[model samples]
Target: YHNPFIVNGKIRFPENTNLVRHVEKWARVRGDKLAYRFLDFSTERDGVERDILWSEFSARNRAVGARLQQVTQPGDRIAILCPQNLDYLISFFGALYSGRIAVPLFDPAEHVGRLHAVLDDCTPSTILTTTDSAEGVRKFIRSRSAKERPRVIAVDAVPTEVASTWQQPNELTTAYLQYTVPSGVQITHLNLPTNVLQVLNALEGQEGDRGVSWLPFFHDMGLITVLLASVLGHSFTFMTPAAFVRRPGRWIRELARKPGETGGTFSAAPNFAFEHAAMRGVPRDDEPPLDLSNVKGILNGSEPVSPASMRKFFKAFEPYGLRETAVKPSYGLAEATLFVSTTPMDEVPTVIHVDRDELNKQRFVEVAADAPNAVAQVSAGKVGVDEWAVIVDTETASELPDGQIGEIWLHGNNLGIGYWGKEEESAQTFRNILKSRVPESHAEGAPDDGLWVRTGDYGTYFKGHLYIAGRIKDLVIIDGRNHYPQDLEYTAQESTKALRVGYVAAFSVPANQLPQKVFDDPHAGLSFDPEDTSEQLVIVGERAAGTHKLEYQPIADDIRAAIAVGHGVTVRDVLLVSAGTIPRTSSGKIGRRACRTAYIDGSLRSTVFA
Candidate 1:
């Protein structure tokens, strides 16, 4: 087949080589262009801008690589623990250029336990960082009584004379040891370029499509899409997460600030970011107006895609030239190296209303949009031509037919080799083949039998589009009925203004073990249904600051009533605690498993009802 996809009006990644080589090529050709620009808000009240031309980025990276080569050998691992600054990029590229495996680790301050786990697994010879984090990293190394402790090197402090000894990496060599999700997946170099190409194709990215990002470089999406722009030769701009969190509107304003048509904007964020922006409302008095008409795409993924959040974003920003067409919902995981299925550009997300009762029965039945029990699900879009996305029955490990909710499995070059050092888990997750199979294919270009990655996510295919429901482990099965935790959390969030958005977690517990109701009412019989012992729903929410006890009592009752009214199931317990009590993943996704443990151990504080 011919290469139908084009970048900058030409075939992209013509040679199918690694990005390390591509960056070198761009350094020679696009030497004078701005390869990457970082918006640093540390000094200036607003922000100070810094730029690295392709040539400069290449030369500096090589110098850093040369410095690393003196200490670490080829095939050796080097850990990177630095702030979101130029040194982080330099240290990463330096490792790639010097033929050393780069392990992009989270800052030691952010997650010490996970960092220690990764350090024990990768066993790097050197840890690269800036002065800001050097002290903490040293203390962390001292805490771990390992046989071998990696030496620390400050990248920016090195001199440029070492550039003479730089050695370019072979295209097929293992370049990155990407430890993601706080030691969740270990991504290798072989999978990196294919995914970069996959993302470009999915986004229809081109050289002219300028990039803007506020995502941290430790994230897969941020590192592959934003920091790796040098390989694709795309003009890029970025700012620290702190800068964006302090003022979320800067992401939109920066896109507007870009020069040229569509304001040359292409960025991605989780669903919460959109909801947060909507909650923050339009720019205040000091903020500038947004013009998102020129935006090519704002890919929303990395967490559950809320139809309500997407709609709210469009409604709030439509007056500022934001088009609904620019909003693209996508689905991916670190195991797949990030890019999976993304909705086509210029098309609004496909929202389907499924009968909640039928969905609980593990069957997807269509219903009217305004149906009282309809659950609106947003499609993540179609898989790429070369990739296959299938929904499979978790029990049988067999592919399920469309409209049936099951575990999501993917077959593609973008799939990671496996987790680092865990042989059984790696094989189980990354090397599985369909057990019950026939030659008949659901997706075009799929082989009769192929190795697939078990995503551990629950989703279904409807009309060739993928709709992610929830994680398989997070599915709350009560009375033989399946309920997605996200849906329950959504209900809990809406039921009370006293609870923070995205902080509520819902899980399953034994009905016989529930705490007794605080208030006894004769009409409570109308809500509670006894003799239902398959399981009971437990909701854990964080009380918003300054919420009075008198105000919180009604909210708890509202939570009990809402679940009964919405899902037709009585909540066993409602526990409210101080802010930051609910556990969340590094990416801010609620950890239902952790919350359930706390609930079961009697650690969660219950709201007093007098």
Candidate 2:
């Protein structure tokens, strides 16, 4: 089958070899080059300021692969639960070397027992973690039956104390010489040959390809940008996601500190990463502007790139000789192995500042950049080098042209194998829409490969660039037209003047009961069971946990107020819930679907009477 998927209207991936070959070749050629330098301000420099060369990374990975070979069959599943660290990256790719599926665990702290819950679900053969977190996993696993727990291996310096049956007297293990994939270990599903997954991807034979990142290795972005991409491209780079978040400017600082011939190329973070650093006045207000001059490709992804953040970073860095063309706002996800699409290399982040009211009506209205009530923001730009094709459309599966809102769908060889044990969810997420772009005749499925993950997100193409509107699942409909809750929440927070920043969450509460007057005469038996049903637009006004609670008003009043000021609609009744009251995913993103369940379960904050 010819892989009809094309890039730049010319090149085509042979559609044969797996992504791992790309990684192996890149690492082989550029061995001994600096691949990573982990800088964590939260910890001391000795433990945190470690750097790994390509050869070092490859060797360490092989060592971990050997250890994994002991407990895991080639096809068996292995999960990781740790922060962005060298070990996490090494173990992840190491597992890949052995052909074992590596499941990445985000934050399992707040979930408590949920860590084991996933293990119970996925039934991974072994788990790779630091010595510190082994106890947490062990306790949670022990809480369940002994039979259900998988083997756990500690990847830190001291493995002697780790509670694992495999770490017995004879087996060799140490950080330095641990880089070897044991012989004779094999696992495959459907006779599938051994393969690898890269956290990042790029064009073949690309020279001088550099990426500056502050993404944590634990996070998908961090893993892809630093570990996988570094291994795959053999490109010179600096960072781990942790360093970027802890000290936002370190990503740039390290680059400036690099040897002469300062200006080359690299990529960094989302809008806020820069703003966070800018918030701390550079050079202590006494020195000159921060020198970001040498940087080339500054990518903004992993989250929405706020226009406010971009403008601030560019304006501030301009004095330091940073080029305006380097700022890039990209769009991607973990499910796809991180390579989705990015803004053009030398292009600055773009915005389609149009009249708010006239946008939806005019379809492709291109208003002045400085138009009034203009919701200025960055766009999730053009497709990248290795990505196959991106399909975007409305909920009806109708293709939304340039400037029209629709969900972003990606069809690529770079797409992930699938969620570990979530077949149902995986099928749902990575499956094809019954109605899709191209045609039903050519819809994704079969060996021919027409798969497309219906990303429950709303985005638009303004002059060929994608602008994301958060998750499509969070959209709550009131009158007829659909409305995105995150965007609405943004407006609601603005309406509250930052009193509800990060505290506000919006959801649609399907109304079931109608107005009722308790028996006036006292003898009236009862009236009819009225069913005046409508979905009320509910918005929660509580900050994230630990912070002070933002003042949450009656949901009805807040909804009506937002509609009046923003959409010019008079909303039906609204419901209010206290802060920290909504259910969210492990990633700290509000799950609107789950939030609605809490509202129905009578578990939400009570505001009916008081």
Candidate 3:
């Protein structure tokens, strides 16, 4: 039997080095086996599930690849702009098989501006979309400069025979242009293969294990599933992100069944998914019950891991046979090619309770679980083989002790080389090196050359486990104490049932920057001295649907109390806004910086401010 996971330091993979070649081998060996199971709910009111066999999937990819070859040459760039469906898969792999660089992009719906920005950066020779999305995409393409616009191809309309003469790309050449925040990163064929193995090793994947996901294919986690199926040759099932949102229970229901139904399963979702599914409640009438006992791994990442969310999910679904140990908290970024660390499936996730005040002071003081001001930090597990992770005091340019919080630095084969077309940024973000060690005694296993990628994330390592604190740029400093925005947002959501759970954005504004009336009368006691260098913590939250009648003043007081009790911080104002008022990243992370900008610019629609 071919083991799916790394056991005894061995991996069962195709003999061919190239990814396309490996995929082709799987199609030949498992021609009739199911490759992808799509639960498409786009047309139907409920849903219509479908499966694509390995041979058909490969042939469709080849056809798309063949069609791509007619318009573009090898090494040219092709952008994929279709929704999360079979066409998106075909277009993405088609680019790979055609030897062209694939630029996976969000559907041209809500992110029209971001799409245009990425187009200007990559300057692809062609764009691929479904017939339904082509009309809007064509309109947008016409709005751009004629010379900059790429030829558009409707992937769904392409014939399977088009891929009959697909060509393989060079293993060393760039395979995809993964566009991340600010700019994009060029991921090569070598990078994909190396990282796919890293992910498999990190997750301890076993052969015949079914894969389940609802993450957008445009996102890093979504793209990783494609690599996993092609390399691991497992029966993978997925639903569109929109469909998952509409009915969060659909994912669990589908994971309960697969082609064989005997193999254990793996699924990945952000922290919000757990919270949403739990809040959505268990199905009562006509809906099938979800049995998660066979699920070996459930990765919680793409956003900060929330212990509260995990506990809620476990509590809600315990009756449905959901395993507590199955929740695997992980950490990764698009720049690193998706996965970096995942808690082993066999081991329960590690959660540490630290003193809230101490954490803000850059200290990791362990506190009792029932301590008055305790904060929990979830571990992202240990570094995988051939991967090096370190906690660096960037200001001092030296490594921090295991318990101290500082910038997180990583050096590994899985790390991408640099940003695409941005040489200055590439050097600044990727070529960073740790300098000036503390002492020989402290530098036992540290590397001398010190090549590291600055993750811009604040974290601490404890006993070989990595715990992410927050982003370095988003930290709010009040009275010289560091406060993480994620902590504040979590507290706000926990304060009231009327507030939207993951829609809150927390940050700090200058004490004197707010209107004088914001601190007058009832709020006078919460006012701060304008001459002081202290910042005021502002929590802007969105009201949940059907909460229009909820009094905003008392809710704000609850938020104030939550923050004060939780983080030992005083809130200056709590602005309750309408739904969809707060900004978010495409992957659904609360955009703290953007929210702060809008708050200052008076662009946010505040129904009530307290």
Pick by lDDT: which candidate is best? 3
After aligning candidate 3 to the native by TM-score, how far in Å is the CA of 293 from where it should be? 1.8
Cα shift from native, residue 57, model 3 (Å): 1.9
Q: Give the lowest summed-lDDT range of ten residues in model 3.
A: 437-446
TM-score of each: 0.90, 0.74, 0.91
lDDT by residue for model 1 (1-610), tens: 1334343433344454666777888899999998888888877967788998989888888888888888887778888987787778888888887778888766687557778877877888999998778888888898877687789988877777778788765444556776652344656565677776677777766667788888877777778767448546887889887677667777877766444464357898888788777867467767655677777888999888888788888898888788788889998888888888889986788989998888877778889888978887889997764567888886787878788888888887667777777788888898877676424445446565778899989888888788888788788887777788888888888877888767788898765455445125332332333554547778888876577464655887899888889898777667787777776655556667877877766676540000
**Which 10 consecutive positions of candidate 2 have the poorest summed lDDT?**
174-183
Q: 1 or 2, which is superior by lDDT?
A: 1
Candidates ranked by TM-score: 3, 1, 2
Tens digit of per-residue lDDT, candidate 2, span 485-549: 65566666665442334445666654553123222212222243446355556555554334344
Can you tell me which runs of candidate 1 are displaced by over 4 Å? 1-16, 170-173, 181-184, 257-263, 435-440, 510-535, 544-550, 601-610
Higher-TM-score candidate of 1 and 3: 3
Candidate 3, backbone clash total: 4
